[PDB]
Write a protein that binds this ligand. Structure first.
Ligand code: A1API
Length: 297
């Protein structure tokens, strides 16, 4: 099941403004972005705030800590810069920013690069210098996905941008996956063998269609750290509707559908994959008053 374990809100605020979340390196501590552009650290069990840092002058949409705990990526709604990289050792400080990229992710195997998305375009940056190494856009192969989000594969040698597979080393598009939907651009399966683009599962080796999974339509997906479970939530204000779905990552078979009966802002699992944190708005409320709910997987 998904048994509720605890709940908390942005402490001492009339309107709680949590917008996104990620577990930190420290087991019991969750990092939350807020609609006023702050980063908060909370104890997930006590529900108490520990620390607060100022990141952006607009709502944080998404954040990602590095695995080693030294770095954090944030993205905001209408700030300049839209995304930034923060150092978290010694003092919390901005290292580099990515002016117009509305989404950013670390590379996966070695976290020495950032990949940012601006519309149909990907930008790769060096973490050391902040320098833009590559711009990935091919007018002949573009799918023009409206919710494109560029990403590295597990070994960092490939990028998926706008449904196009790029070889990072040569900076060449090697394959365009055919377009089946208007919005979702896709992700790599952590197994390194498959690419999941909306409802279509493609083989990375042959570029053959392996499976169709209709329940993934319009979903953002995240895997548990172990790579055994895939979580998906349909995009619908709140980025998501009121439900998320789980699937077996080995065979794409549905496990569970959870309707939390409130709009979802974000979802994450801890490094040990024991707990799920979900940001939920207290259907289609104009009032912003989010809680973080912790669930047992
Ligand atoms: C109208 O909204 C105004 C402005 N707000 C936004 O834009 C907000 C954007 C935004 N928030 C969270 C995400 C996101 O993708 N979260 C990932 C998990 C993660 N943290 O990686 C995710 C995966 C599976 C799930 F089941 C759930 Cl519920 C969440 C996203 C998100 C949504 C769409 C895209 Cl293309 C990229 C994104 F990062």
């Amino acid at each position: 099941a998904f048994r509720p374990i605890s709940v908390f809100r942005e402490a001492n605020e009339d309107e709680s403004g949590f917008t996104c979340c990620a577990f930190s390196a420290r087991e019991r501590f969750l990092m939350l972005g807020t609609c006023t552009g702050q980063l908060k650290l909370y104890n997930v069990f006590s529900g108490q705030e520990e620390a607060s840092y100022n990141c952006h002058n607009s709502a944080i949409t998404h954040l990602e800590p590095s695995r080693d705990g030294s770095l954090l990526l944030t993205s905001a709604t209408w700030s300049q810069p839209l995304s930034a990289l923060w150092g978290m050792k010694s003092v919390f400080d901005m290292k580099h920013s990515f002016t117009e990229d509305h989404y950013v992710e670390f590379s996966k195997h070695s976290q020495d690069r950032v990949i940012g998305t601006k519309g149909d375009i990907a930008h790769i940056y060096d973490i050391q210098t902040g320098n833009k190494l590559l711009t990935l856009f091919n007018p002949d192969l573009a799918n023009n996905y409206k919710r494109n989000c560029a990403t590295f594969n597990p070994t960092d040698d490939l990028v998926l941008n706008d449904g196009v597979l790029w070889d990072v080393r040569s900076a060449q598009a090697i394959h365009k996956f055919d377009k089946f939907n208007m919005n979702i651009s896709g992700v790599f399966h952590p197994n390194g063998l498959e690419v999941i683009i909306n409802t279509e599962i493609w083989d990375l080796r042959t570029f053959h269609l392996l499976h169709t999974v209709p329940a993934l339509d319009q979903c953002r997906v995240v895997f548990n750290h172990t790579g055994t479970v895939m979580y998906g939530a349909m995009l619908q204000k709140s980025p998501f509707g009121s439900s998320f779905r789980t699937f077996n990552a080995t065979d794409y078979k549905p496990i569970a559908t959870i309707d939390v009966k409130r709009n979802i802002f974000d979802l994450c699992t801890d490094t040990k994959d024991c707990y799920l944190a979900v940001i939920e708005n207290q259907m289609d409320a104009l009032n912003m008053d989010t809680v973080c709910r912790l669930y047992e997987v």
